[PDB]
Amino acid sequence: PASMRCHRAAHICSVL
Amino acid sequence: HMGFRWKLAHFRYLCQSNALPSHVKINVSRQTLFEDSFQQIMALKPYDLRRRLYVIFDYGGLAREWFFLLSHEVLNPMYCLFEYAGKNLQINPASTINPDHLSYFCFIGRFIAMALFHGKFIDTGFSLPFYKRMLSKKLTIKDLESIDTEFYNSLIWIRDNNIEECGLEMYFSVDMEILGKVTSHDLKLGGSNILVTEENKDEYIGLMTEWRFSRGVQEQTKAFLDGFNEVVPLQWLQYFDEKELEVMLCGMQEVDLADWQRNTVYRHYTRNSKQIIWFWQFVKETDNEVRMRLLQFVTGTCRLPLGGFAELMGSNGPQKFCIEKVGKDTWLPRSHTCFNRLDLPPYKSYEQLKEKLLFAIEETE
Ligand SMILES: *CC(=O)Nc1ccc(NC(=O)C*)cc1
């Protein structure tokens, strides 16, 4: 998905 | 809300019948106000603060000048007890730098309780989720939204998207680094060794939410509450909600309606929307107690900035009172206090809008 999910998962662990 | 004037009458009668004879004198200086109050209060036994108060720097306007001034200084980032941790307030988790921080928080809770006991107002003020903690009320995920937007957004994403197609690998433990410590925390016993899965989402969300409120501040909060409880025991606040506890401490100001109305912004609405015409008509009729409870429900506080509504601040900066159309006439209204935003559904008549506001203002958080 144009490298989707991969960037949110990295962002969610970084936040939590 | 509901019978609030009954609620405080009962409380004033509680303090008045628990008062103690004689008095306590408090000598303080203008420039050393908070070191001196700390030493004279902490030298007195807690129930001595229930006696008559004599502050020599009327013989009761000196007391009000004490409770205002000291209120500003104790919540002033200088002793490093409090961190804004919003943007432009709450307990600072780095207060451990001060070896005696727990002694200062005992004093602060004792001082807040004196204000309530003596019916005086403070000019500082904590957040609604803090007041819920004082009342032993369950903290929700909307309270999370008010303290930590970006932490709130991540937990919401886990709640209604499956984290299996995302590649998320998470566990029931969270680190936190304060002053370069990196302290791990197991949400349950042996929690670091259990993967967060789509079946146990709900719990993890709940544990993460509950842990976020008291991260690095458990000891400080426990000292504040222990000191408060010594002067005004917490169970005397039993009939109050967090919105009422804030007003009791901060006092009531009357809202300037012309200033409010001309500094309100709209999303998917206009001043020419009938839902906005009806909204402004509603606030023209209701009490000013209802107006203040509505400011609480939407902005997160009853206090108004220096400057009026033009100066309203939210998360990342200036953030004016905002109304936005969402959902349908069957929905209930709701709010996002970090954004000073009211989600006002497109109701069908004035009466439906008035009934549904008053419900949200008085009954929901
Ligand atoms: C492309 C990709 O999958 N990135 C990724 C996934 C997960 C995480 N971290 C956790 O799951 C905790 C980082 C990056």
Author numbering:
A (entry chain B): 2 to 17
B (entry chain A): 544 to 600, 607 to 637, 641 to 917
Show the paper's wording:
We show that Helicons are capable of binding every major class of E3 ubiquitin ligases, which are of great biological and therapeutic interest but remain largely intractable to targeting by small molecules. In addition to possessing increased stability and membrane permeability, Helicons are capable of binding large, flat protein surfaces that are inaccessible to targeting by small molecules, and Helicons have been developed to target a range of PPI targets in cells and in vivo.
First, we focused on the NEDD4-like E3 ligases, which make up approximately a third of the HECT family. We began by designing three HECT-containing protein constructs: a construct that stabilizes the autoinhibited, inactive state of WWP1 (WWP1WW-HECT), and WWP1/2 constructs that are able to adopt both the active and inactive conformations (WWP1HECT and WWP2HECT). The first profile (Group 1) represents Helicons such as those in cluster C71 (C71) that are pan-WWP-binders – binding indiscriminately to inactive and active forms of both HECT domains, which share ~70% sequence identity. We next solved the crystal structures of five Helicons, four in complex with WWP2HECT representing all three groups of HECT-binding clusters, and one from Group 1 with WWP1HECT.
